[PDB]
Each structure stands twice: as C-alpha cells, then as structure tokens.
Design a protein around this ligand. Sequence first.
Ligand SMILES: COc1cc(C(=O)NC2CCN(C)CC2)ccc1Nc1ncc2c(n1)N(C1CCCC1)CC(F)(F)C(=O)N2C
Length: 127
Amino acid sequence: SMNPPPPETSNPNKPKRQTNQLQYLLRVVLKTLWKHQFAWPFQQPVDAVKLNLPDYYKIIKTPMDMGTIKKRLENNYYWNAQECIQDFNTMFTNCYIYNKPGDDIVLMAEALEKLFLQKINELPTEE
Ligand SMILES: COc1cc(C(=O)NC2CCN(C)CC2)ccc1Nc1ncc2c(n1)N(C1CCCC1)CC(F)(F)C(=O)N2C
C-alpha cells in the first residue's frame, strides 16, 4: 500500500495572525518536546511503507506528527492555539490507538505527553 500525502502545512487562502500563545507553542512547547530523547519517531509522518505497516493507514485516518505541527507553526497555519493543541493530542492518541499498552513506542509517546501537559499547564494567558 501507498502512504497518503502528508497533512497540509500551508494554505495561502487561510487568514493568519500571531498570538502570544501560538508563539509559546513554537518557542517553548514544540522546542522542548523536539529535543527529548524519545522524540525522534514523532518528528515526521509515519512512513508505513518503509516501516512495513500495511494496516497503519487502514486504522489511523487522521495522521499527525511533530514535523507537521512545526511546519504549521512556522507557516502561521494555525489561527487558534487550540488547533495546535488538538494536533498534539491527535498525535498521541493515534499512537495509543494503533499500538498497545506497554509497547516501547507507547512508552515513548507517554513521556512526551507528560512533558506536553506540563508545558500546556504553563500556557500564558491570551494577551
Ligand atoms: C526511522 O523510523 C523508525 C525506524 C525503526 C527501526 O529502524 N527499527 C529497527 C530496530 C532494530 N531491528 C533489528 C531493525 C529495525 C523503527 C521505528 C521507526 N519509526 C517510527 N515512527 C513512528 C512510529 C513507529 N516507528 N512505530 C514503531 C513501533 C515498532 C516498529 C515501528 C509504530 C507506529 F505505528 F508507526 C507509530 O505509531 N509510530 C509513532
């Protein structure tokens, strides 16, 4: 089976704004997660072909990854911080859905999610 095209990261027809919360999501949240020792499987779309997972895109219909999230942030693709937060949650929950409790990849996602939740708890108030 083929991989799907990666999620869209740019759309010239979308309105754009910068907010202190979206700036925080890029400068603090994404940066903190990216450098984590368990980040690397989440830094690009799942390549189901390379990984020989023919059923991955049969099961996961809303793929997401931190490479995509970062590009969306850099491109001012998001209008609301909540959109970006949803994309992180989609990434984590896709991992839990496809895989099984206790799997190494799940433990990796769990560590990132812990850190994510800590940083989102420190999200500054909308200015
Ligand atoms: C360079 O990339 C990899 C390389 C190798 C790699 O090189 N593995 C080697 C390990 C040692 N043997 C000897 C050869 C292959 C393994 C995994 C990689 N990448 C990856 N990215 C993302 C996911 C994932 N993997 N998952 C893992 C679970 C276990 C097998 C895929 C399952 C998943 F479903 F796709 C998933 O949810 N995510 C989040």
